């Protein structure tokens, strides 16, 4: 028994209708896709940074590791 | 125009629900229904014939706990409610078909 014994809640009215009287995905582009644009904004700039700051760190310590393996002519410029 | 009975435009029914909450009040009621025909139809000699075999109850009818209504007996056996009554409220065009009982705050559920 959890329902019932949750909450003291007074004078909050609420209407709803049947699944049946309404449209299962409404204004997808009037309401939807703007709160998606707005959701992807209002959070970017939290997210991405350290994600790219991550994805230069790989390149460099990539490229970094296979110009090691290459040669440095100045090992050779007096090798006759 | 003056001898013209006006025919008034047609009311529409939802399935839907209204929930006004006060846990500061000792009882609850709940209501619900169908839509109904309208005064016109035969059908509503066979509704009120339904809501016959369901009835109605209420804490002070002696009949108790034999109560021919199986609702009522329930409603006896398991303290479900402080009532309930059936109806079949009929307008011109349509109607409400349904239910109402008043109980406590936790055997809403049982009795609905």
């Given at each position: 028994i959890h329902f019932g014994n949750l909450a003291r809640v007074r004078h909050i009215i609420t209407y709803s209708l049947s699944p049946?009287?309404?449209?299962?995905?409404?204004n997808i582009f009037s309401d939807a896709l703007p709160n998606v644009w707005r959701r992807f904004s209002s959070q970017v700039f939290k997210v991405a940074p350290p994600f790219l700051g991550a994805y230069l760190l790989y390149s460099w310590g990539t490229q970094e590791f296979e110009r090691l393996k290459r040669k440095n002519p100045a090992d050779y410029e007096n090798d006759q | 125009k003056e001898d013209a009975v006006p025919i008034l435009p047609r009311c529409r029914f939802t399935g839907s629900e209204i929930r006004a909450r006060?846990?500061?009040?000792?009882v609850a009621h709940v209501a619900l229904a169908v839509e109904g025909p309208g005064?016109?139809?035969?059908?509503n000699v066979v509704l009120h014939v339904a809501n016959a075999i369901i009835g109605r109850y209420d804490r002070?009818?002696?009949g108790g706990k034999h109560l021919s209504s199986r609702l009522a007996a329930l409603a006896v056996e398991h303290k479900l409610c402080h009532s309930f009554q059936t109806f079949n409220t009929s307008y011109s065009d349509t109607g409400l078909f349904g239910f109402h009982f008043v109980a406590d705050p936790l055997s809403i559920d049982d009795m609905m």
């Open positions: 049946f009287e309404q449209r299962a995905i409404p | 006060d846990d500061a009040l000792p005064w016109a139809d035969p059908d002070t009818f002696g």
